[PDB]
RNA sequence: UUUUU
């Protein structure tokens, strides 16, 4: 049994891993490359995607899902298989590539022909391909996210996907890995651990607190799938002690996702089933409004606070926030809350620098308003959670992060008596 | 830590 890195080695984005195991060859996650190495997505594969036999995918996110119409597009016409809730995420984050795709890399057919072949898998369901026994795992890292289980030749190999912050309160907990002869996985935080969660919340709610009660306004840059709609949660829950204010989800994207949660209410933790069970969507406190289009999102700019704002790019890098920002940076009144990473040497980066005066869309702009970073509210498990969920796991082969941030993990691996390595593209590993 | 008016 082998497994091929071929994407997110020594870097986060890119996953696709072939499992070559039981007479037949497996890819695991099909993501594409972003940032950077978005031209990459225009590049081959390095493996012949006619001679895969059947897919598997962890998450619905785009890094882990956005070449699989590349792979159809060239030949690929097997199955897919992924959780319900991975399958109907799918379809949105596939949906929004085609049309915000600068240079793109497939077509609408590739797309529709991709959807075509998905094949539901849930967790504890055993798929059998030849000699090869695969499985779902919990990961808790989105609705319907997994780490695989390959078991094979008298062998047991786990790809972890992308693990959730167990700290959260959203998703349910990361299941435990089945101990193996080797475990594939993700290392983003491997150099720290988060701050921690409860603590998170209560600064948040104190920054939104405080905000609103002079009639500020709170910037929030959002991803679309999981993080808008798991703020959304905070306000419904806890949002009982803020002043009355809108709260505008301007994000289309997060409004089509928000709609088809109450789908997926088994995928979340007890917590949120329990609310739905009592007939109460925890994902939409009171003056949620969602914006559509770009006249009331714009408007948003010159409608004084108090009002609580979510919009993308996630990472500054484009999107209805830059609008938000360039308007309401200036005042000190306003606040700006990250909720996710951002990469050192974009713009939030250099917003948090705190230097005079920003430029955003073409023009140097005040730093006036308070800005704060709550990494607390990660989806990915800090370094002491990765260091907990490897426990005991003989050899470790480390992707998806960088690589400095891989190696602080390893060290603390290898000292541990555990066996790692950084995975490189298109080395194969023996399990 | 991944699309976005
Ligand atoms: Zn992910
Ligand atoms: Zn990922």
């Not at 996985?185 to 939104?208: C, K, S």
């Not at 709609?229 to 505008?248: D, F, K």
């Not at 007890?270 to 009171?286: D, I, S, T, W, Y």
Request: hydrophobic share 40%.
């Amino acid at each position: 049994m082998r497994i091929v890195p071929f994407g997110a080695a020594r870097e986060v984005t890119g996953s696709a891993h072939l499992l070559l195991a039981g007479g037949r060859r497996v890819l695991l996650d099909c993501g594409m490359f972003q940032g950077k190495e978005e031209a990459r997505n225009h590049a081959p594969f390095g493996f012949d995607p006619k001679e895969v036999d059947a897919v598997l995918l962890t998450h619905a996110h785009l890094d882990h899902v956005g070449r699989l119409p590349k792979l159809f597009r060239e030949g690929y016409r097997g199955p897919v298989y992924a959780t319900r809730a991975t399958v109907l995420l799918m379809e949105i984050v596939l949906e929004d590539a085609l049309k915000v795709m600068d240079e793109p890399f497939f077509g609408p057919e590739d797309v529709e022909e991709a959807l075509g072949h998905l094949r539901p898998l849930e967790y504890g369901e055993w798929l059998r391909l030849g000699a090869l026994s695969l499985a779902f795992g919990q990961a808790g890292h989105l609705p319907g996210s997994a780490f695989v289980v390959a078991q094979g030749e008298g062998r047991t190999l786990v790809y972890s996907g992308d693990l959730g912050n167990r700290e959260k309160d959203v998703l349910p907990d990361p299941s435990l890995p089945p101990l193996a002869d080797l475990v594939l996985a993700e290392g983003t935080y491997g150099d720290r651990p988060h701050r921690p969660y409860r603590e998170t919340v209560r600064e948040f709610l104190e920054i939104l607190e405080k905000t609103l009660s002079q009639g500020g306004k709170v910037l929030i840059p959002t991803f679309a799938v999981e993080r808008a709609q798991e703020i959304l949660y905070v306000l419904y829950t806890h949002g009982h002690r803020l002043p009355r204010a809108p709260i505008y989800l301007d994000s289309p994207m997060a409004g089509r996702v928000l709609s088809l949660y109450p789908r997926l209410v088994r995928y979340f933790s007890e917590e949120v089933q329990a609310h739905f069970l009592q007939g109460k969507n925890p994902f939409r406190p009171a003056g949620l409004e969602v914006v559509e289009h770009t006249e009331a999102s714009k408007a948003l700019n010159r409608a004084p606070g108090p009002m609580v704002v979510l919009a993308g790019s996630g990472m500054l890098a484009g999107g209805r926030i830059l609008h938000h920002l360039k308007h309401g940076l200036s005042d000190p009144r306003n606040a700006l809350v990250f909720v996710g990473y951002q990469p050192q040497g974009g713009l939030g980066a250099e917003i948090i620098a705190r230097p005079p005066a920003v430029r955003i869309l073409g023009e140097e702009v005040p730093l006036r308003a308070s800005v704060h970073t709550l990494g607390g509210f990660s989806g990915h498990a800090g370094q002491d959670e990765l260091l907990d969920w490897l426990q005991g796991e003989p050899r470790v082969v480390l992707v998806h992060g960088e690589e400095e941030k891989l190696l602080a993990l390893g060290k603390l691996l290898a000292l541990r008596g555990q066996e790692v390595s950084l995975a490189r593209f298109g080395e194969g590993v023996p399990v």
